[PDB]
Amino acid sequence: ASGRALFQYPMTSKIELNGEINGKKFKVAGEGFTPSSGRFNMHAYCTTGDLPMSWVVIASPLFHMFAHYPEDITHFFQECFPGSYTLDRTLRMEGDGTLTTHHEYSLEDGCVTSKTTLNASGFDPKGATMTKSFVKQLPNEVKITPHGPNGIRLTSTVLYLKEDGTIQIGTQDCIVTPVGGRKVTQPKAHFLHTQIIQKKDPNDTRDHIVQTELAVAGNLWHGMDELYK
Ligand SMILES: [Cl-]
Numbered sequence: 001a002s003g004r005a006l007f008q009y010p011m012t013s014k015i016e017l018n019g020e021i022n023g024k025k026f027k028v029a030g031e032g033f034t035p036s037s038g039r040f041n042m043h044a045y046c047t048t049g050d051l052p053m054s055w056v057v058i059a060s061p062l063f064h065m066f067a068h069y070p071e072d073i074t075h076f077f078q079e080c081f082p083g084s085y086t087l088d089r090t091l092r093m094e095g096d097g098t099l100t101t102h103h104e105y106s107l108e109d110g111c112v113t114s115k116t117t118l119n120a121s122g123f124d125p126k127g128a129t130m131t132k133s134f135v136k137q138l139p140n141e142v143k144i145t146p147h148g149p150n151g152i153r154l155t156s157t158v159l160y161l162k163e164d165g166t167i168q169i170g171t172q173d174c175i176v177t178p179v180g181g182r183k184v185t186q187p188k189a190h191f192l193h194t195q196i197i198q199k200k201d202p203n204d205t206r207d208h209i210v211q212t213e214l215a216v217a218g219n220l221w222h223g224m225d226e227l228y229k
Pocket of ligand 1: 053054055056132133
């Protein structure tokens with residue numbers, strides 16, 4: 001049993017996230033549900049106190065193996081199992097700060113555990129990330145291409161909505177590296193439509209978020225694959 005056969009739904013998730021932003025150290029944990037392909041939720045919470053940054057910005061740090069792929073595009077993230085992969089992200093909040101994250105994953109008993117680190121340095125202390133002035137981030141299309149002999153790269157531009165209805169941009173890039181000692185067949189260049197929605201639990205006492213991601217792959221631009229050898 002490998003690849004897509006390891007992702008029979010429903011499944012669950014856990015996260016352990018150790019973070020630091022502008023020298024403010026924090027920890028997040030969470031548990032989540034993946035009812036079906038491409039729809040995955042996570043109820044996270046700060047275990048150190050209040051989260052010292054926007055929950056909207058931390059949303060993408062908070063599981064691409066749960067994205068929904070058609071049969072005719074390789075689901076690289078699922079095909080990495082068994083063995084797993086690492087994810088390394090850079091998120092540049094333009095004019096604000098840059099953060100990085102590193103993710104390791106393990107699958108056991110239908111549950112993917114993410115162990116993530118986040119490091120953010122140089123953020124504007126009056127910016128929207130630190131002041132928690134974002135309402136949501138808009139849905140976007142993430143470009144996925146082969147990268148190196150055995151990886152893939154994900155890129156996106158994110159529009160972050162401030163309370164005043166205006167936008168701030170983030171630029172996001174990730175590299176995905178199989179860690180399983182084996183070559184995983186790269187997909188053709190394609191895109192992932194991603195929507196992140198956040199709400200609060202009616203009763204939880206912690207600083208927390210209840211987040212849902214919808215992530216659906218498609219060959220949006222058939223010609224794109226020719227450009228990536
Ligand atoms: Cl927030």
